[PDB]
Amino acid sequence: VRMNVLADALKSINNAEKRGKRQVLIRPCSKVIVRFLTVMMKHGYIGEFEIIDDHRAGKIVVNLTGRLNKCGVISPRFDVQLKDLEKWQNNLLPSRQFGFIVLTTSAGIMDHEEARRKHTGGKILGFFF
Amino acid sequence: MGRVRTKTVKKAARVIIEKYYTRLGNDFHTNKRVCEEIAIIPSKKLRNKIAGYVTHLMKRIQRGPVRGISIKLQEEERERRDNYVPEVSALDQEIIEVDPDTKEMLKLLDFGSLSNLQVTQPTVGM
Amino acid sequence: SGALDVLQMKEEDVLKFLAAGTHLGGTNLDFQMEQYIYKRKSDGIYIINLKRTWEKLLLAARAIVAIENPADVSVISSRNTGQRAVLKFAAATGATPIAGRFTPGTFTNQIQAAFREPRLLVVTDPRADHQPLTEASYVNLPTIALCNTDSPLRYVDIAIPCNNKGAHSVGLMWWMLAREVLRMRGTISREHPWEVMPDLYFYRDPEEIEKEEQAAAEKAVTKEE
Amino acid sequence: GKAGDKEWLPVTKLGRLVKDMKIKSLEEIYLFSLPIKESEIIDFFLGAALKDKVLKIMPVQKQTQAGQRTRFKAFVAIGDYNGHVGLGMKCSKEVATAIRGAIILAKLSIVPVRRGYWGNKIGKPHTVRCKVTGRCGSVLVRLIPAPRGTGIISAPVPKKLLLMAGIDDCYTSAGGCTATLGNFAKATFDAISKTYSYLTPDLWKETVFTKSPYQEFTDHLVKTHT
Amino acid sequence: MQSNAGEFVDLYVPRKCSASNRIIGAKDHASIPMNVAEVDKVTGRFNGQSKTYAICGAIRRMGESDDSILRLAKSHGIVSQN
Numbered sequence: 001v002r003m004n005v006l007a008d009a010l011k012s013i014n015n016a017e018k019r020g021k022r023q024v025l026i027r028p029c030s031k032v033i034v035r036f037l038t039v040m041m042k043h044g045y046i047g048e049f050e051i052i053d054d055h056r057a058g059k060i061v062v063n064l065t066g067r068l069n070k071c072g073v074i075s076p077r078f079d080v081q082l083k084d085l086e087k088w089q090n091n092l093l094p095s096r097q098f099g100f101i102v103l104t105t106s107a108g109i110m111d112h113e114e115a116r117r118k119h120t121g122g123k124i125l126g127f128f129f
Numbered sequence: 130m131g132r133v134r135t136k137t138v139k140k141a142a143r144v145i146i147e148k149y150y151t152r153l154g155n156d157f158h159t160n161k162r163v164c165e166e167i168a169i170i171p172s173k174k175l176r177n178k179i180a181g182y183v184t185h186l187m188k189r190i191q192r193g194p195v196r197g198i199s200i201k202l203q204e205e206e207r208e209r210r211d212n213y214v215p216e217v218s219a220l221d222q223e224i225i226e227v228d229p230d231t232k233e234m235l236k237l238l239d240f241g242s243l244s245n246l247q248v249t250q251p252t253v254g255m
Numbered sequence: 256s257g258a259l260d261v262l263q264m265k266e267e268d269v270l271k272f273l274a275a276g277t278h279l280g281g282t283n284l285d286f287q288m289e290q291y292i293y294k295r296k297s298d299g300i301y302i303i304n305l306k307r308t309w310e311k312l313l314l315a316a317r318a319i320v321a322i323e324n325p326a327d328v329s330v331i332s333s334r335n336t337g338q339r340a341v342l343k344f345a346a347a348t349g350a351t352p353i354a355g356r357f358t359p360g361t362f363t364n365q366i367q368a369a370f371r372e373p374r375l376l377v378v379t380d381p382r383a384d385h386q387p388l389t390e391a392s393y394v395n396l397p398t399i400a401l402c403n404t405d406s407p408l409r410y411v412d413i414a415i416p417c418n419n420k421g422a423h424s425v426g427l428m429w430w431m432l433a434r435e436v437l438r439m440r441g442t443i444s445r446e447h448p449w450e451v452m453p454d455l456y457f458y459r460d461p462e463e464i465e466k467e468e469q470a471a472a473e474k475a476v477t478k479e480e
Numbered sequence: 481g482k483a484g485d486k487e488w489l490p491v492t493k494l495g496r497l498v499k500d501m502k503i504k505s506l507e508e509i510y511l512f513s514l515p516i517k518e519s520e521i522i523d524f525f526l527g528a529a530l531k532d533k534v535l536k537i538m539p540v541q542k543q544t545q546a547g548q549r550t551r552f553k554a555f556v557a558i559g560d561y562n563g564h565v566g567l568g569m570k571c572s573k574e575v576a577t578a579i580r581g582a583i584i585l586a587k588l589s590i591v592p593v594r595r596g597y598w599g600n601k602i603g604k605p606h607t608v609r610c611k612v613t614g615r616c617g618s619v620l621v622r623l624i625p626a627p628r629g630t631g632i633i634s635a636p637v638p639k640k641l642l643l644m645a646g647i648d649d650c651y652t653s654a655g656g657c658t659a660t661l662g663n664f665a666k667a668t669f670d671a672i673s674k675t676y677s678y679l680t681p682d683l684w685k686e687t688v689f690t691k692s693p694y695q696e697f698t699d700h701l702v703k704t705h706t
Numbered sequence: 707m708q709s710n711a712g713e714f715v716d717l718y719v720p721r722k723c724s725a726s727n728r729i730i731g732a733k734d735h736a737s738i739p740m741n742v743a744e745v746d747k748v749t750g751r752f753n754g755q756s757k758t759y760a761i762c763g764a765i766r767r768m769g770e771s772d773d774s775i776l777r778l779a780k781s782h783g784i785v786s787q788n
Binding site: 507508510511512513514515563589591592594595596597601602603605673676677679680682683686687689691692695 | 707708709710711713715716717718719720721722728729730731732733734735737739741756758759760
Binding site: 193210211212213214215216217218219220221222223224225226227228230231234238240243248249250251252253254 | 269342427452463467
């Protein structure tokens with residue numbers, strides 16, 4: 001089956017970081033997972049990552065540090081309209097000061113902090129902190 | 130019957146042999162009178178007991194070392210066993226050779242002397 | 256190693272390692288002892304690498320140097336083989352031996368009169384002295400020990416592999432340990448023969464000692480005759 | 481008439497360095513994550529700001545062939561209003577002895593708390609840094625940060641501890657059997673511990689690994705001292 | 707941690723262990739600093755300035771510390787090719 005790919009992905013890197021690891025193997029490589037981890041890399045929670053290529057769908061390998069505490073998925077994907085936002089981020093984050101809800105908009109995939117400056121609502125995907 | 134010695138006897142019996150090892154004989158009466166002079170035991174019947182156990186210990190101390198108390202000459206022979214044993218002065222017999230798969234490690238670590246070869250059969254218990 | 260060949264293993268010591276059978280190691284393995292092994296024979300026995308033994312010897316010994324008090328690097332061994340060896344170790348180099356049965360609570364009490372607070376430990380065989388290891392993780396002691404292939408690693412920070420099933424492997428290794436700490440701290444350095452040898456760090460052998468002493472007395476009497 | 485105390489001769493290494501006054505704060509001790517094994521060390525650094533608040537004095541008793549035998553088990557809180565709190569339990573045959581056993585034990589187990597801000601700064605932290613939890617056998621607490629001047633909004637039991645901690649603003653919620661308050665307070669104390677054990681982006685810069693007091697002050701301890 | 711002034715607060719800034727990248731609390735008595743002694747590396751004699759490390763109790767108690775202490779010394783010295 002593997003109904004939702006992204007939802008199975010994050011639990012590995014969540015589990016792996018707890019035990020004390022710094023290399024993982026996540027499959028089967030969706031484009032959606034790439035742009036997620038790109039945003040998550042900029043802020044600094046993970047390091048550079050290598051995309052292995054296969055014809056089947058690829059495999060991805062990540063280098064990570066203890067800075068991450070947990071990245072979760074939120075499924076199914078609800079809408080946000082920039083007044084629903086404040087209610088979401090209260091429940092899902094440890095603090096106002098840091099933590100980053102991610103979402104996708106027509107202006108691309110980004111954190112919530114950026115979307116507020118573009119006046120774009122959209123569909124929420126996950127979170128991390 | 131019964132009459133198993135208590136701990137009050139066995140505590141002081143060990144002490145009295147450690148610090149007055151020289152004074153001891155192996156006779157009952159001599160070991161009694163020594164305990165009477167090197168200490169006071171406030172009863173008479175108690176004195177007759179502590180002497181008898183001091184005697185019974187001193188029999189065994191003239192064999193191998195007791196594990197409840199120490200004397201000097203045993204710690205001498207302890208030291209004499211624990212500074213050189215007559216078995217070796219050589220390390221270990223100076224030349225010992227090894228079989229292959231150890232030689233392959235040594236090949237890749239710049240060593241190439243003093244070896245033998247035997248390529249012993251397969252396998253575990255077989 | 257670090258320095259090019261003034262710390263690296265010599266041709267001499269190789270003979271001593273092989274004569275004491277240190278290279279041999281038991282049938283059963285652990286998943287923390289996989290890297291130290293090179294391979295198996297054609298028979299059940301797994302051959303520890305001696306290069307990998309040598310590197311672990313050094314930073315182990317260098318940590319024993321790094322303390323500014325040599326009276327609180329408490330060594331421990333409770334096996335009979337490891338009694339005579341440790342006694343010479345902590346007599347030669349300033350250290351504190353705890354020989355035989357441990358008598359628990361000696362790193363966590365305020366009432367016991369054998370209470371001590373050291374910094375390091377140097378243990379023979381985790382599976383005879385499991386007691387001090389558990390108590391080390393209640394008062395923040397660094398820990399060093401001698402592991403075998405089948406000895407698991409848990410509450411130890413660094414291992415020093417060895418064959419150590421009761422052999423000349425034991426006493427040889429404790430001698431080498433005391434040799435190195437003196438090359439860095441002491442004035443024994445020159446790295447050309449030390450007066451003290453590994454021929455009295457080896458096991459008592461009490462029945463073998465009495466028989467050798469009797470045979471030496473008989474050989475002395477027959478020499479006098 | 482006759483005067484002069486003499487109290488507290490250390491039998492502990494860490495205690496001796498304090499008595500000679502070459503360790504200048506508890507904050508050094510906590511940074512090396514050392515045990516504290518004496519109750520006078522803490523009472524040397526502090527002792528004029530520590531209050532106690534005896535929570536409950538609870539009986540328990542077992543059964544034997546001659547009937548009941550009852551021992552009194554009391555919980556006693558402790559804390560100054562600058563960030564250090566502790567908690568202790570003890571039981572004994574009689575009451576006062578058990579209380580005095582707990583006032584000692586609570587000082588021994590004392591820890592610091594980490595305070596933080598709401599969403600903006602104006603100096604002096606008033607609340608909890610992050611949203612944390614703490615569980616003790618089916619009781620849990622969810623300490624949630626709160627803006628200034630809301631007060632501590634909690635049940636009576638954690639309102640003691642958090643107020644002594646200097647955490648003046650908090651939202652909370654409980655889950656499970658809070659009737660058995662021994663769980664409830666230990667679960668609160670569990671939560672209050674996690675504040676310096678929660679990683680935040682502030683702390684991401686790497687530590688310098690400064691040398692230990694055990695190492696530097698070892699020179700005085702080479703006499704006979706242990 | 708900074709404020710409006712940039713004034714630093716928090717009673718102690720805790721220390722962060724080498725191979726786990728996490729912070730050890732006030733009570734945590736399985737966490738050890740481990741001092742390796744440097745040498746001059748011309749004569750192989752002790753020379754002063756130490757390399758100091760720190761390890762948390764979690765990696766210690768599972769038996770992963772042995773690899774971490776090895777890797778730390780492998781990225782520096784004394785370890786060449788093990």
